[PDB]
Every structure is written in structure tokens, then in C-alpha cells.
Design a protein around this ligand. Structure first.
Ligand SMILES: *CCC(=O)N(c1cncc(Cl)c1)c1cccc(-c2cccc(Cl)c2)c1
Ligand SMILES: *CCC(=O)N(c1cncc(Cl)c1)c1cccc(-c2cccc(Cl)c2)c1
Lengths: 306, 306
């Protein structure tokens, strides 16, 4: 037992991280087969980043303007192209550590692991959720651009996130690996800001089931509620609506604990209206919304990856 | 910015995990050079685990009684020996993925990353602290024995923990990699229990500095306190004493924030006596004690590992 904010093993992604340098700008790239992926604003200088025309900026570049370092070994760039907000650097060497992979775009509410890196060198790994406002509450310093987010399914890495920027509230914005931003953000220096967020209701319910599996039961109660009447309370507390599909997804967890989904909704309702009254759930004094039903089943049942 | 519970990249340890089987017992082993390390109770059956004589049990075993699986490849055991509570299985093949490593024993209060595994297959990675009572609040299911904890310093893996067992409160006990238990626990099935814990004061202070670095300042105040007078309050709230050495270790963080250590102690005093009053610090409604001063400096400054 126990319940932790658990990341996927990072090895398969570590073998893909490289350093990309263009001018005085250095950031991280992702090396898969003979292509290196990185944020396109690598080609921008300080004054370029104000209001850039990336097509003009890139045509002015040569292959030799891009230095790629894989460890202490240099990769020769033989081609380059722009795909939306990412660069694709064609290198003469295919990465022998290329795992089986996919490029997938995730939904707000879904989680992933982030391998934070600097200068192509992995620093740490942690678990994040895509917020409803399409930001992530990451941990990123200067130089972390090009760090990627991902999930692993058996042996296949599904890349879902490339880090680009920090917004003024200290949260982070980026793209999928096709270079399409998550949310209404651009790779220019404007006054863009996050905009209002909500709590991921289905994930909170998943975590309450995690707690019951792990022995926390004080918040349970005999009452029940209708889906409609729960959603009336959810809206009042800035929680997003619960759907019949969310109820279905919570089915296995319900059946394992013997607590009907709508019964857990009644408990969440009471926790929202009364607070937690000095008690804790899975070591938290707040309702936690960054574990999915998938995450709870994986951790409380024990699936591995090879 | 941002602040996450960050683990070390796990790749270097993933390449060392193997499956060890003896009879019907299967658990994880750590393969370094030509030795596989694993919990000695791998040789125990259900009835053996009651009150075992491990020396008697082991002399009854042959090399061929130990099946080691490194992926889909079998390692031939050519020797075996007991070192305290771990087994050392001599195999005919040295692990070509052996990183530079050390076997280190950590102190309560120190943190480490755990690579949870099942059947020699890594499942997830997360960050833990050695509690003052020598347990860890892990996340472990049946089959996780032999999973290891570790830190990484540039390129060298310092192994500090091998998982052995779960205690009745759902916390976890294990050994260092020389097989010496952390705390007063044994690898037999007795009524052993955790025993009373405390909060890691210096770590809470480190995290308050993390918060100030990251823009949370509401808990600051003009007052100060003496080290003695703070420790009088710490004892009352089950916090462990703060030493002059802890104050020294907090020096860099103090100097970076401009907040004297004893001034932060005054703030912690007020937070202990008044609570948090519906506010949060770094996304937490509790005082968090599982980041060290080292951890805060690493994450808020940005050190990598190669
Ligand atoms: C781009 C690399 C990077 O990691 N940057 C960064 C990311 N997270 C946190 C911090 Cl503190 C910095 C970064 C550095 C400078 C400027 C930007 C930027 C500005 C405007 C638009 C974009 Cl897409 C990026 C990012
Ligand atoms: C030993 C492998 C293992 O992982 N075990 C376990 C660990 N963490 C959590 C759980 Cl739920 C199980 C384990 C399984 C059965 C018995 C023990 C045990 C009992 C008494 C002494 C010891 Cl050293 C181990 C451990």
C-alpha cells in the first residue's frame, strides 16, 4: 500500500535527450531515429522574440548554424524544416537508443511524466496533469525548453508535451510533438496569461477511491446524490461537470471498494461544503485532482512496463 | 519556477533490475558487475517466514535453486552467499549496464528516489524521505521486494535502500545495500510496528525558503526568535530540534532570500501556533517536510546529472 505521485521510469526518454545550440541560444532537443525535435524559437535572439516572422528567420539559417550535442559527441545536421512551433533537424546519425514511440496529444485532465533537462542532460522526473486551462504546474528553470512529457504503455513511449515557456503566474505552456500549442498561447513575447482554471472532478473522485483502498474512510457517509444534484454543487465550487462517462470510468474502482460512484459524490459534496476539519486524506489536507482513474488502478494494482 | 516532488532520472538503475526466483518466491534483484543483490527472505517459504534460521535455510540450497532473469535472458548463478539480510548471487555474466555506483547508508531526514519494480520490471519512480523512525512512506505492493532507493551525483549512483516489507500502518521498512536494516525491524513475521515519528524541522524550513523563492510570502513576519525559544515550540508540536548545524546548512537559502534563518523560525512558530488559515504554500495545506536544503537548492537553481 501507500500512494505517491509516481512518474514512469525515465530511461527510455533519457536516451533521446540532446543539446541543441543556434547562435547563443542553447536548449534541449528530442532525438528519434535521424530527427531532432526542438522548439522553433531556438532560432530567435532576444530582440527576435518580441514579434518574430519564423519563416523569414529560418530561411536565413544554414544546416551548420545548428550544433547538436548527444553527450560528448557531435551530431551533424544535414537538413532542417519547420513544423508549426517545432523545428525538425535532420541529422546524419539515427539514435540507436530510439524506443518504440508515438506522438499523441492528451486531453486536459490527463497526466504525464516530465523529464526536466538542461543542456541535453536530464535533471529530474516528475508527474504533471494538463490543467483544464491547458497549462501545467511544472517545475522548470531557464534552459529547460525542449524537455518533454510522456507516458509509457508496456514498451512504447507516447510523447505528449514539449516545454516552451513560463507564463507570469509561474505555470508552464508548451506544444504537442507536432508543434501545436496546448491552449491559447503563442511563441512570442506578449502579455499572454493562463486564464481561469477548474478542479478536475473525476480525478478527485479517483483519489478518494485510492484513499478508501488505502484505509482512509472517515469522509464516507450513508447519503447518496443524483448526478444532476452533484453537478449543481460542483459548479458552485469551480469543479468541472461530472459525466455519465466519468461515472462509467470510475466503475472498476467503485466495484473494488463497494462504494457506488454517486455515493462517493455525496462524500465529495460534504467535503466541499464542510472542509476537512483538521483531518487528512492520503497525507493531503486538500482535495487532490492530479491522479486519473487510470493512475489509481495502476498504482493500487501494480502494472509495470518493459 | 514551480516546485515538484522530483525524482532522479531512473535510467541508470533500470538497467540493473532483474527478477530473482527461488521455489515459488519471485522478487527483484539488483545486478551490478557479476553480483545480484536481493532480500535474503527469497529463500523462505510461507511457514519459513515465521521464525527462520537463515543459515540453516541457505546451506540447504544449491546455485541451481536460484533463477535470475535479466529481461528475457537467463543468468546462470555460479555462487551464493549471505551478507546480513541480503543475498549475493554470483552470476557468470557481468552487467554491461553497470553504472558507477556506491553503497551508502543515509540518515533519517534525507531523501532518495525509489524505482518500484515487479518481476524485475520497473513500474514507477518517486521521491521518499527516511523518516525519523527509520520507516519510509512508500508505495509498494506484493512483489516489490528488492526494489531500491538511490541518489545520483553527476554520473554515480549512490544506492541507499533495499525494500523488504510493509509494516501494519502501511509504511515500509528495508535495509541498506549491505543488508543492515534501517531501524529496529527484522526479516521475520513478528508484531513489529513503526513507533512514534516526528516532523523533520530543517526540511520544513528548507521548503518555506523554496516557497519564498517561488513567490509565496504571506507567512513571513517582522518578528524573530532565538534558537532556544524556537526549539521550545518545536518540541511542543512533535518537531525535532533544530541545531546550529541546521542553521548553517540553511545559510545559502537564507542569503538568497534575505530572510534570516531565525526569522523563518519565527514564521514557522506562527504557522504552528495559528495554522494556515485557509491559505496554501507551494500548493500544500500542510507543512511539508520531505525536501532537504539540498533538494531545494537543486530544484530552484537547476543541477543536472550525466
Ligand atoms: C525556451 C526554453 C525555456 O525553458 N524558457 C523557460 C522555460 N520555463 C521556465 C523558464 Cl523560467 C524559462 C524560456 C526562456 C526565455 C524565454 C522564453 C519564451 C518567451 C516567449 C515565448 C516563448 Cl515560446 C518562450 C522561454
Ligand atoms: C518481500 C517482497 C515484498 O515486496 N513484500 C511486500 C512489500 N511491500 C508491500 C507489500 Cl504489501 C508486500 C512482502 C510480502 C510478504 C511478506 C513480506 C515480509 C514479511 C515479514 C518480514 C519481511 Cl522482511 C517481509 C514482505
Amino acid at each position: 500500500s501507500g500512494f505517491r505521485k509516481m512518474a514512469f521510469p525515465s530511461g527510455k526518454v533519457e536516451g533521446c535527450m540532446v543539446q541543441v545550440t543556434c547562435g547563443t541560444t542553447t536548449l534541449n532537443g528530442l532525438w528519434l531515429d535521424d530527427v531532432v525535435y526542438c522548439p522553433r524559437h531556438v532560432i530567435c535572439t532576444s530582440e527576435d522574440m518580441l514579434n518574430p516572422n519564423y519563416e523569414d528567420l529560418l530561411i536565413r539559417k544554414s544546416n551548420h548554424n545548428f550544433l547538436v550535442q548527444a553527450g560528448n559527441v557531435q551530431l551533424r545536421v544535414i537538413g532542417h524544416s519547420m513544423q508549426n512551433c517545432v523545428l525538425k533537424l535532420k541529422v546524419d546519425t539515427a539514435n540507436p537508443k530510439t524506443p518504440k514511440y508515438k506522438f499523441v496529444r492528451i486531453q486536459p485532465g490527463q497526466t504525464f511524466s516530465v523529464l526536466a533537462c538542461y543542456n541535453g542532460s536530464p535533471s529530474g522526473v516528475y508527474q504533471c496533469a494538463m490543467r483544464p486551462n491547458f497549462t501545467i504546474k511544472g517545475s522548470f528553470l531557464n534552459g529547460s525548453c525542449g524537455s518533454v512529457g510522456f507516458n509509457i504503455d508496456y514498451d512504447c513511449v507516447s510523447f505528449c508535451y514539449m516545454h516552451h515557456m513560463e507564463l507570469p503566474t509561474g505555470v508552464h505552456a508548451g506544444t504537442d510533438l507536432e508543434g501545436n500549442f496546448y491552449g491559447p498561447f503563442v511563441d512570442r513575447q506578449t502579455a499572454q496569461a493562463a486564464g481561469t482554471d477548474t478542479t478536475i472532478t473525476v480525478n478527485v473522485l479517483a483519489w478518494l477511491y485510492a484513499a478508501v483502498i488505502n484505509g482512509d474512510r472517515w469522509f464516507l457517509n450513508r447519503f447518496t446524490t443524483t448526478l444532476n444534484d452533484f453537478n449543481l454543487v460542483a459548479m458552485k465550487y469551480n469543479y468541472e461537470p461530472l459525466t455519465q462517462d466519468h461515472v462509467d470510468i470510475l466503475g472498476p474502482l467503485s466495484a473494488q471498494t463497494g462504494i457506488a460512484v454517486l455515493d462517493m459524490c455525496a462524500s465529495l459534496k460534504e467535503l466541499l461544503q464542510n472542509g476537512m476539519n483538521g483531518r487528512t486524506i492520503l497525507g493531503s489536507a486538500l482535495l487532490e485532482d492530479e491522479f486519473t482513474p487510470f493512475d489509481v488502478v495502476r498504482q493500487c494494482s501494480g502494472v509495470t512496463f518493459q
